[PDB]
Design a protein around this ligand. Structure first.
Ligand SMILES: Cc1cc2c3c(c1C)C(C)(C)CC=[N+]3c1c([nH]c(=O)[nH]c1=O)N2C[C@H](O)[C@H](O)[C@H](O)COP(=O)(O)O
Ligand SMILES: Cc1cc2c3c(c1C)C(C)(C)CC=[N+]3c1c([nH]c(=O)[nH]c1=O)N2C[C@H](O)[C@H](O)[C@H](O)COP(=O)(O)O
Ligand SMILES: Cc1cc2c3c(c1C)C(C)(C)CC=[N+]3c1c([nH]c(=O)[nH]c1=O)N2C[C@H](O)[C@H](O)[C@H](O)COP(=O)(O)O
Ligand SMILES: [Mn+2]
Ligand SMILES: [Mn+2]
Ligand SMILES: [Mn+2]
Ligand code: NA
Ligand code: NA
Ligand code: NA
Lengths: 477, 477, 477
């Protein structure tokens, strides 16, 4: 529950020390910002606040890696700064069950109205938008962002997150996969020979984009869902030109209309997919930007895609993957679950149970492998006992390294993949052949003889936590 | 919604002709009744009403195979006599979602009070109980039955179905698997050095035992659930001796108490498990029978176990298996489901989808294989396209025979089984080794080339149904 | 040993009651007859005798499903109406060994001469020929039929069964696979610039077509073989126009000549292959029909292809498949064979042995899998112990469901298939790639521990037969 981006940054330095966010002066938008973000992300550095970008006025800032740590996700979710990775999951999972839609609160004034820019004054190049990676088609101002549209017939307002590239001083490309709600709406104003009116937020309260990104059902306005996660409706404004609701204290908004493909498209160069590879460039859907709103010292909220095994700068904890699988395991009557986690979004799913029967391990693997398809590359599935910290790749590895008989525990299944999968050959795709496969890896102590298992040389968790909280100041631990 | 067994039999002959139930005179309780039931069941004969059993008074009857057909399950569920097998599933599945507990209705009079028998008059041998199979430990009067107990502290009343063998003129053995609600309750009166008071119904309205058998949650009195499936609470009576609620128009009730194992057990010979094999004999939990209630011409409702690939005389349609898997496939986001069915309870699960993507088939297989473990022998899983009648073993076979590449479509998975599995070796069990396996068989037309699939030489379903309903009288069809 | 079709129908109602054959009035040749045949066949109804077909004179009849039951095959083979399925096999197998060629008996008069039709009077459309399935290329009067030709040089007369479609009022298409004896002969009269003279029988004594269908060696006139199975030579007539021998009391004969492909072909639409799929339409070999002979109230003997897992209306017992495999198992020194059966012609072969050694089961599987290739789709092979009724799909299933360890007993072999196989992809065929595979499934009680196998809950066979023959009238059983 944040007022705006700045309340969030503050909150971070309140709960974590002034070191938790660090301001960087004189990095360049071209490659340099992105490359810093990527390395800092790998090293779980501070959240980065980029200032005095050469060619740009002071306070014209970029904020990256803003939720690229466990402890950060906890603050953002407003739990104790020191809440465990798996506790966050437990929390998220259970929030899921007790949240009702709380609508946005109208509100009359707000920081978004400090600088409004119309007709000629509309220059997208005014922002210090980075070119995040060599090979991007342009500069992607719209990453951790909101794309807002209103259904004209009902009045549902849908906020989702589509990549937005700067295509000129008044054009912003968006890429929406076929099935996107924004597009569903959009087509109402097309089959009526108007444009589809749209606003697009490119910096603001991260809880809001956390929500924009949530795969909310149709008809359901993800503004409400945000209200749900914070507990009070979000402070909002009729955008002047289009009427659409935008955040009162947002950082930067573009308003205006998006016509049909057949009338104006632009070339939307590649950008990185979630699997850590560049997707395809095409002629994409573009928006004519008619208004720019921005606060003084406007910050862009930047989440450029990284390879998925790097901490994800916009939520390092895999909230959705971990939690939704966990609900499926329960529904699938798997028992004594101690934890569910995902590395690289969903490419290794990990499950920690307490085995009470011979079939538990294989039952959890098949359960996890059969859950609701999402992003359509699946690969590894790993079950382990209740003494493995599955949020700690090292610990999971040691289990894969020391509790797996490869002749018995590795189950390679031959199954199809999806076009998105970087490992499908041109020859295969073209022939409609989607064969890939998955691995079910049973890394559990064998049940028949579990009590006879060699004992781990490692401190128990309680003690680990006694020493941690005792040697708090002194030493990272 | 039946008044009693006799309303049900009537209903059967009303909806199906007087041929649907047939009365059999002069078969013997020893083997002969059972053996007739088994063959008639295989041939989907009439529901059998056994009369003039030698050594027994007229009207002392046995009723078997009472729901051993699709069309019978439909009448019992009170849908059109001619409702399709899969329509029944669709119905059951959806009833599941709209039923609330409707409690039993007290009622003052009823047919159960025509003959009450106390102290010396209590002779279990009075009933023409069959010895259903050679190898049964005795005569099993308690098959399609209700075992009623009341929790003394709360007052929850639990009705479940445990095998009941006649162990003398006043003793009835029951076998309850460790985790049975009756036993949960029972242990309250043991840890208090009283017996556990119990009544046991051995003939009555089959909807009632349909419900007794439903794996209802703890705390939940499956009398209510019966109320749910019929739409009105069930007509019921405080049994005189124990207070427990029993059906007003029931056929035969035994009331009395069951002490702890350590005080009186009996040898409870084998009887057939659901997998079509004899389980183990042991010293079992026994009930001292103190009252016998029975109507004039009392009928025993008999469901002896058959091998599971025979039509199950007590519900030939696999209501629970088919429906609960279907809910899991939905939850697991499998789509365009046309049908789910099970042969031999759950040993082949079959799923009919309409493929819209390369991964559908394997996704449905894994989804089904990971669902909530129940009876703990799993074996085959089969997915097919939307033109297969999966309720017709012949049609499913032809798909397994003509749409499976064995080198690509048969996925043998190595997984553990449970002690109940007749194929686990003594050597394995003793060593705690439960290895068995399952098969995922993709019997779908290959998606990459589906439109090029050879065309089936078989009448479309609409036409099949035009000719069927047109040539109705004339010819079985 | 039947006089003609009518002696056969009679024989059926003599041995089985008047219910065994049922006369159907006012079904239409277009689809309706076929669709009734198919459903009645699935339900093992009566043999169907179709009368008063709209547009057609009375007694112009169609007879289907004429041998679509075990008990029917027994009557046809003239054994006790109640001979077991496997007894029929045992009988067939052993007949095979004691039959010598008994030639046809000349005879002077016969029912075939009641109506002869020449030049203009030749109208094939006169018969109430059904269009058996939607998708057939025309109406297939020639299904359960005889195609008779005489070798001009030697005088061998060959009768085989090729599909015959009505192609006009005086043209009948035949499709002969490359290697067919009729064609072998035919080519003698082509390489001599005459037509090949031919007669084609389309209703008659079913023993005769049983024989026409028998894959008799070259040089061997399958008229003789018929003599062998009945014990007396068959009553026969020089057809007037061509001289060829035809049955004295046949129902319907067409006589005339068939020229070479290059001189007159017709389009021979698809019809159903034995694997339950439509084959390819092509330009086919046609016969110019010059004579029509028919008895008063002439019946067409109709065996339309059904999917192979339906009871085959023309012999539900798989005489040839079951018996010839059985001889191979013997020759392959497999021992204590109790039974061999086939479902869907040959797509699951089943073998029942009495195991006396560790290697028996796998030895029977490989033996069966290596036998003489016939129709060129093979798929499943199943061995079981001597207590399985392998003629009862339910019983075989329960064995596959409860006696197979999938991790040990399922042997998938990678082997090529043939073009006929509906599951081979266009891409594969075109590349000359015939990979498919087969499964060897050992469903035997494991020998090492067989005596410890859980005991079947099912009535022994003797008793099953005591109750069956005791409760004969009373109840189907
Ligand atoms: C978090 C997030 C989600 C992206 C996304 C990105 C991020 C960071 C980017 C900016 C890094 C790369 C682009 N993204 C796209 C995307 N969906 C889409 O169709 N096109 C995209 O370009 N999504 C998915 C989208 O955010 C969620 O699936 C929404 O719930 C879908 O919105 P909707 O349900 O209202 O249609
Ligand atoms: C339909 C049915 C279910 C049997 C059953 C049978 C049938 C026909 C028989 C009579 C053929 C063989 C015996 N049965 C037993 C049984 N559960 C058990 O612990 N012991 C048994 O002997 N069950 C299971 C029981 O009916 C259901 O699982 C109940 O929902 C469990 O009751 P509860 O939930 O109240 O404890
Ligand atoms: C029983 C039977 C066998 C058919 C047959 C059918 C049936 C019902 C039909 C009518 C349903 C479909 C068509 N059939 C053809 C066929 N052989 C062939 O080359 N073309 C066919 O069209 N055969 C095979 C033929 O009957 C036997 O293989 C003969 O033994 C071969 O005759 P021959 O040995 O004298 O050449
Ligand atoms: Mn949405
Ligand atoms: Mn219960
Ligand atoms: Mn021949
Ligand atoms: Na969204
Ligand atoms: Na119950
Ligand atoms: Na032949």
């Amino acid at each position: 529950v944040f007022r705006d981006l700045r309340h969030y940054i503050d909150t971070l330095t309140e709960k974590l020390g002034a070191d938790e966010v660090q301001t960087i002066k004189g990095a360049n938008w071209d490659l340099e910002i992105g490359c810093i973000t990527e390395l800092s992300a790998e090293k779980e550095g501070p959240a980065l606040l980029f200032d005095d970008i050469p060619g740009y006025p002071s306070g014209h800032r970029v904020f990256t890696n803003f939720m690229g740590t466990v402890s950060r996700c906890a603050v953002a979710l407003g739990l104790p700064a020191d809440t465990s990775a798996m506790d966050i999951i437990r929390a998220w999972k259970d929030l899921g069950k007790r949240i009702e839609p709380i609508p946005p609160v109208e509100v009359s004034e707000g920081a978004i109205l400090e600088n409004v820019l119309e007709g000629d004054d509309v220059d997208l190049e005014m922002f210090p938008t980075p070119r995040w990676h060599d090979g991007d088609g342009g500069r992607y101002i719209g990453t951790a962002c909101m794309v807002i549209t209103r259904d004209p017939d009902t009045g549902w307002v849908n906020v989702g997150t589509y990549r937005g590239c700067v295509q000129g001083k008044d054009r912003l490309s968006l890429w929406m996969l076929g099935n996107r709600h924004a597009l569903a709406i959009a087509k109402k104003y097309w089959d009526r020979g108007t444009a589809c009116p749209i606003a697009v937020v490119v910096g603001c309260d991260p809880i809001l984009t956390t929500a924009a990104a949530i795969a909310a059902p149709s008809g359901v306005c993800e503004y409400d869902v945000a209200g749900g996660l914070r507990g009070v409706g979000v402070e909002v404004i009729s955008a002047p030109g289009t009427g659409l609701p935008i955040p009162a204290n947002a950082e930067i908004v573009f308003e205006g209309e998006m016509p049909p493909v057949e009338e104006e498209s632009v070339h939307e160069g590649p950008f990185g997919e979630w699997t850590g590879y560049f997707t395809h460039a095409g002629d994409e859907t573009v928006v004519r930007v008619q208004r720019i709103l921005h606060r003084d010292s406007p910050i862009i909220l930047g989440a450029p895609p990284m390879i998925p095994t790097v901490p994800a700068g916009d939520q390092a904890v895999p909230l959705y993957s971990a939690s939704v699988t966990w609900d499926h395991l329960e529904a699938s009557g798997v028992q004594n679950i101690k934890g569910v986690w995902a590395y690289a979004r969903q490419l290794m799913m990990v499950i920690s149970i307490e085995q009470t029967g011979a079939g538990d391990a294989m039952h959890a693997l098949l359960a996890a492998a059969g859950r609701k398809r999402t992003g359509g590359v699946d690969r590894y599935f790993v079950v382990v006992d209740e003494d493995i910290d599955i949020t700690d790749i090292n610990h999971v590895l040691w289990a894969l390294f020391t509790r797996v008989d490869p002749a018995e525990s590795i189950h390679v299944l031959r199954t199809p993949t999806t076009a998105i999968d970087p490992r499908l050959s041109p020859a295969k795709r073209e022939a409609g052949d989607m064969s890939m496969g998955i691995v079910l890896i049973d890394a559990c102590k064998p049940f028949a003889w579990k009590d006879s298992y060699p004992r781990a040389n490692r401190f128990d968790e309680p003690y680990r936590a006694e020493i941690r909280d005792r040697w708090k100041a002194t030493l990272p631990l």
